[PDB]
């Protein structure tokens, strides 16, 4: 029961301030195990040993209470100060008569902080009565309850009811002012359901996830069988692969993103706060799995139509186009169905990313731009498909091949420049820009070398040497930057955790080392994939190296997301921030 | 929140004794709606109207409290009396030194009654104020809390702590005597998790249900496609149908049984108590759905192997045998895996049914025997398959065809006779026997008529007339008996619910009428299916009428289970029985 419900309801950013139930359990069990035999030694020794343990046990118990009391007062003062800041401006806004739209959100987030603080009250108290009670039972002494009533039930930790008064005042103020007296409508948005891992997986979405996964497996098996015991007149099926691997990557990416979300939620990494999502409602891993399964079902159905043509009236080049058309329509569906809120949030994010640097750069946009590097292959395939339809496919080094490959790098570079301009500090906002700048040089030098080699110019060897130098430089730079800042590893305060930071959110310490090795191996042979697929070195084994390595790098990005989000959470965990700091906007 | 959590946590057998939260909500809303306008009439009228409503509202509120108080005292006395009965015999058993094995179970059930009574305490109190809190908010008066403290918090309903003392005494007694001081092991079996609909659907089993359903759909579609756009050399595939329809019925039956379980759990029908299952753990509809999906997957895979032979080294007659072999092995799996407890409970039940009348007849065994009538087709197919393998299938009116059809009827008839012998009352234990006796006469007369017609005897016409008379008699008898006793309909106290009983558990009243019509239609044309498939009237359209009607009758049994269990629950709901009455056994 407890020690699991506690973890599932702990706010990750306040994990340290929470009472260590597991530590007390371990101490009690160890003390019970290290019980001298009654007859081996004198009887008084047993009582003497127990008394020593009791003093130490309560000594740590008092320390936990003091820590809880100190932390609670800081948060109470912070909320009290924040409320006055929110209250005083309300008169100013009212005296003056967009702003109200942002104002409503500010109160909601502040209310959430009050609730979380209240949960820190009730939850810890349960965890304190739930911990002594075991001590009394294990040690068959009743002094635990006496200590609890003497100290835990009188401490200002939960004695004080200021939080409930503040909540009532907030509800009344919101209802009277912002919602125009409609209490029901106010509390509809002001009430916070269980958060974090406490939220249960809906039965229906889980069934849909299983329903779509099952069809996916059988369809994949049917595809494999179709490859072997079926159509043999392949005759350059390579364009089909070049068209469908983009969707395959777009589908594998969603599954891995769902796995990332599951790991974040279970491991305690608060991705909701980092991405600025509203805590009350958010997408869990099940929804992402369901979306990925549905898209994979469509992909497999289209590929099966291409292999076994069910209807011979329409051509075989309509399925790969209709698949992506439906994908786009689902993404840009205007109706309020099929994850309207999430889809439109993603669309606004993508517009902000692609329209940079004309919008302020946050974290979600930067993270998304950093992931479009993995989707460079998808962009390249889209360009090739457009060219193939507009210039080939009888309906019965072009100079942009390299440019398309540098688009996401350009987005990240310009976003970094905008961040530097806003913050006006070069490090890390400028050094990060140079990381993506090397990609431009690598790509252009590779293209020039290929052009010269095809034409037989005399500068081919020097261009090759310069390109390889820039390639090693770029790979080393990006790898070092990743390992040193995106993950935070190789810290000077590693201590016991060798080649790692002081604190690691994930339980197992081998995951970090395996990820380091994987990133080192895969970052190399990715820049190779970037240089290739944008050049005319060879048309055999080039496309078949690009296709193999394309999904491999997505796995690398999937791994990288874990530790990037963990580093961000650690950064925002030392300041004890659990609610988004929302401004009220001017006027 | 509430009015739904209340229903999901109400013990169905004590639904009436529970406070009517919904009725109070409806009364409050109606009173608020019927609010005279302030200015239309004199102001004093508004207060006068509200005062009248307040008096009536509290008048019913007091009645609910008195009803709760009266019911609780009866249960408290019953448990107190039961505890002494269980306690006093303990000394007798101890003074005397199988019995202990039954004794442990008796304490567990008694403990469950104590917990359920405790839940009736806390749950009603929550529901008791929540309602009054709404009244204060809606009527903007604080008198609700004053009334609650004046009466609800002082009443013997939840003031008294005798239940907690009884629970502690029971735990101590069990731990000291039966479990030999091992408190942890005692409480492992003595603790009751949430019951009824309150239990949540596991995520993993739901995913497996969806996973197996998805494969099932795609495999069925593949089968349909294989029928049309694939193998055409059928050439009397009828033996394949005769072999596989038995498994098909055995698979459809499980899905419908899962639907029955879902309806029972959601509608409040306590099937756990009726079947004597242990309340702490039981199979929900998800598990039955998962089992049915897995068996259907095996069936579809075997049929697909028969159509498309993946491997040409083994013959095509091995798949239909291996399917049933695996089914049997799963049912009789000795390892403690894949629903060991449920599988072995079912096996003991089946042994008791098939070995009758040498064992006392309960409800689960009778219910199962009544359902083997629907599986007469499965038994017939098994017999035909055995004969086909032992006398035909080159490995490169026989007189038992009718007998096999009467086996489940014989089981039900002998069980009814045993019930009559035990209870020593003819009605209904003897009249029920005659219901299954007519089937014997129908079958034997049909077989004799067919034999005479084939041989051309002169008694064929008289045999036919007698057979049709017995057929109409049997169908009318079974139909009337069903509608009148198994469902309880056509009661003299129908009142508003025309052609129905006083109380109907299921919400919609049209379900009962639709079920009546369906049973009337399907009971006819089932006895026709019984007469056919056991005779040589014709070999074209006979097997194809037996196959069509075989799954149709399973649907009828699926419908019949709903109302049979509902009638049983109503029978055990008027005595307010929520825990199995377990004897202590002699000595």
d(CA B389, CA B321): 10
State which residue of chain B sits closest to A289, comparing Cα positions: B207
* Burial (0-12, 13-18, 19+ Cβ within 10 Å), B173: middle
When scoring B175, B193, B215, B265 by the number of chain A Cβ atoms within 10 A, the one with the most, hence best to mutate, is: B215
B439 near B530, Cβ under 8 Å? yes
Q: Which residues of A touch B219 (CB under 8 A)?
A: 218
Q: How many CA atoms lie within 13 A of A529 on its CB side?
A: 23
Q: Is residue B419 a known part of a binding site?
A: no
d(CA A253, CA B40): 67
A296 near A276, Cβ under 8 Å? no
Nearest CB to A206 within list B206, B212, B218:
B206
How far is residue B127 from each of residues B16, B131, B272, measured CA to CA in Å? 14, 6, 26
When scoring B211, B289, B297, B301 by the number of chain A Cβ atoms within 10 A, the one with the most, hence best to mutate, is: B211
A285 near A261, Cβ under 8 Å? yes
Contact B214 A219 (CB under 8 A): no
d(CA A364, CA A354): 13
Q: Is residue B373 a known part of a binding site?
A: yes
Contact B212 A215 (CB under 8 A): no
From the CB of residue B145, how many other CB atoms can be counted at a distance below 10 Å?
A: 16
How far is residue B533 from each of residues B106, B250, B372, B377, B408, measured CA to CA in Å? 48, 18, 16, 9, 16
d(CA B382, CA B327): 13
Q: How far is B1 from chain A (nearest CA, A)?
A: 12
Exposure string (b/e) for B481-507, b if CB count within 10 Å is 16 or more?
ebbebbbbbeeeeeeeeeebbeebbbe
d(CA A30, CA A33): 5
Obtained via which technique? cryo-EM
Helices A510-523 and A543-573 cross at an angle (nearest 10°) of 140
φ/ψ region of A533 (left if φ > 0, alpha if ψ in -120 to 50, else beta) reads: left
Q: What is the CA radius of gyration of chain B?
A: 30
Q: How far is A292 from chain B (nearest CA, A)?
A: 15
From the CB of residue A391, how many other CB atoms can be counted at a distance below 10 Å?
A: 7
Long-range contacts of B258-262 (CB under 8 A, 24+ apart): B258/B285, B258/B286, B258/B287, B258/B288, B258/B289, B258/B292, B259/B285, B259/B558, B260/B558, B260/B561, B260/B562, B260/B565, B261/B285, B261/B288
Contact B206 A208 (CB under 8 A): no
d(CA B234, CA B455): 33
* Burial (0-12, 13-18, 19+ Cβ within 10 Å), A492: exposed
Among A214, A201, A202, which residue's Cα sits nearest to residue A296?
A214
Q: Is residue B523 a known part of a binding site?
A: yes
A144 near A152, Cβ under 8 Å? no
How far is residue B317 from each of residues B222, B307, B323, B392, measured CA to CA in Å? 21, 11, 11, 12
A235 near A323, Cβ under 8 Å? no
φ/ψ region of A532 (left if φ > 0, alpha if ψ in -120 to 50, else beta) reads: beta
Contacts of A161 by beta carbon, 8 Å cutoff, 6+ apart: none
d(CA B166, CA B78): 12
d(CA B377, CA B384): 10
State which residue of chain A sits closest to B308, comparing Cα positions: A229
B570 near B505, Cβ under 8 Å? yes
For residue B412, the Cα-to-chain-centroid distance in whole angstroms is: 18
Contacts of B378 by beta carbon, 8 Å cutoff, 6+ apart: B246, B249, B250
Q: How far is A203 from chain B (nearest CA, A)?
A: 7
Among A121, A87, A168, A156, which residue's Cα sits nearest to residue A18?
A121
Contact B213 A218 (CB under 8 A): no
How far is residue B23 from each of residues A80, B71, B341, measured CA to CA in Å? 42, 20, 42
For residue A513, the Cα-to-chain-centroid distance in whole angstroms is: 20
* Residue A200 DSSP symbol: P
Contact A200 B201 (CB under 8 A): no
Contact B206 A210 (CB under 8 A): yes
Contacts of B561 by beta carbon, 8 Å cutoff, 6+ apart: B257, B260, B367, B371
Contacts of A152 by beta carbon, 8 Å cutoff, 6+ apart: A65, A125, A128, A129, A132
B570 near B488, Cβ under 8 Å? yes
Contacts of B146 by beta carbon, 8 Å cutoff, 6+ apart: none
Q: Is residue A436 a known part of a binding site?
A: yes
d(CA B499, CA B493): 10
Quick one: CA torsion of A344, A350, A354, A358, rounded to 10 degrees? 70
When scoring A215, A221, A294 by the number of chain B Cβ atoms within 10 A, the one with the most, hence best to mutate, is: A215
Question: What are the backbone dihedrals phi and psi of residue B480, each rounded to the nearest 5 degrees, phi first?
Answer: -60, -45
- Resolution in units of Å: 3.1
């Amino acid at each position: 029961k407890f020690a699991e419900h506690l973890s599932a309801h702990i706010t990750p950013e306040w994990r340290k301030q929470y009472i260590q139930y597991e530590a007390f359990k371990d101490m009690l069990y160890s003390a019970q195990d290290q019980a001298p035999s009654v007859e081996v030694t004198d009887e008084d020794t047993v009582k003497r040993y127990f008394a020593k343990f009791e003093e130490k046990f309560f000594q740590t118990c008092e320390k936990e209470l003091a820590k809880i009391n100190t932390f609670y007062s800081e948060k109470l003062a912070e909320a009290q100060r924040r409320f006055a800041t929110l209250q005083n401006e309300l008169q100013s806004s009212l005296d003056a008569q967009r702003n109200i739209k942002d104002l409503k959100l500010a109160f909601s987030e502040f209310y959430l902080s009050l609730i979380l603080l209240q949960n820190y009250q009730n939850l810890n108290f349960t965890g304190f009565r739930k911990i002594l009670k075991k001590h009394d039972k294990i040690l068959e002494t009743s002094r635990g309850a006496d200590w609890r009533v003497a100290h835990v039930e009188v401490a200002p930790f939960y004695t004080c009811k200021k939080i409930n008064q503040l909540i009532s005042e907030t509800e009344a103020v919101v209802t009277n002012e912002l919602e125009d007296g409609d209490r029901q409508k106010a509390m509809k948005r002001l009430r916070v359901p269980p958060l974090g891992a406490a939220q249960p997986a809906p039965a229906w979405t889980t069934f849909r996830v299983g329903l779509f996964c099952g069809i996916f497996i059988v369809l994949n098996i049917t595809l494999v069988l179709a490859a072997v015991f079926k159509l043999e007149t392949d005759r350059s099926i390579w364009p089909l692969i070049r068209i469908y691997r983009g969707g395959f990557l777009l589908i594998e990416f969603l599954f891995l993103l769902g796995i990332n979300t599951y790991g974040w939620r279970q491991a305690g990494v608060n991705h909701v706060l980092i991405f600025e999502l509203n805590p009350r409602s958010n997408l869990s891993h099940q929804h992402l799995f369901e979306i990925a399964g549905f898209l994979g079902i469509l992909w497999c159905l289209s590929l099966l139509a291409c292999f076994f043509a069910p209807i011979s009236v329409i051509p075989t080049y309509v399925y790969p186009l209709a698949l992506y058309g439906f994908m786009v329509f689902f993404l840009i569906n205007p109706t309020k169905t099929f994850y309207y809120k999430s889809r439109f949030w993603l669309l606004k994010l993508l517009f902000r990313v692609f329209t940079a640097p004309f919008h302020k750069v946050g974290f979600a946009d930067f993270w998304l731009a950093d992931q479009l590097n993995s989707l460079s292959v998808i962009l390249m395939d889209l360009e090739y498909m457009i060219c193939f339809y507009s210039l080939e496919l009888k309906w019965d080094t072009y100079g942009v091949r390299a440019i398309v490959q540098c688009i996401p790098a350009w987005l990240c570079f310009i976003q970094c420049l905008r961040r530097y301009r806003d913050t006006k500090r070069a490090f890390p906002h400028l050094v990060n820009a140079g990381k993506y700048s090397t990609t431009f040089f690598m790509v252009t030098f590779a293209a020039l070398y290929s052009t010269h080699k095809e034409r037989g110019h005399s500068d081919t060897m020097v261009f090759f040497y310069l390109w390889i130098v820039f390639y090693i430089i770029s790979s080393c730079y990006t790898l070092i930057w990743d390992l040193k800042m995106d993950w935070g590893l190789f810290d000077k305060n590693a201590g016991e955790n060798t080649f790692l930071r002081e604190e690691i959110v994930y339980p197992q310490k081998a995951y970090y080392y395996c990820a380091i090795i994987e990133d080192v191996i895969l970052r190399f042979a990715w820049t190779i994939q970037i240089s290739i697929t944008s050049t005319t070195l060879l048309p055999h084994s080039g496309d078949i190296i690009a296709t193999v390595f394309a999904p491999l790098e997505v796995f690398r990005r999937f791994v990288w997301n874990f530790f990037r989000l963990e580093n961000e959470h650690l950064n925002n965990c030392g300041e004890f921030r659990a609610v988004r700091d929302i401004s009220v906007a001017p006027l």
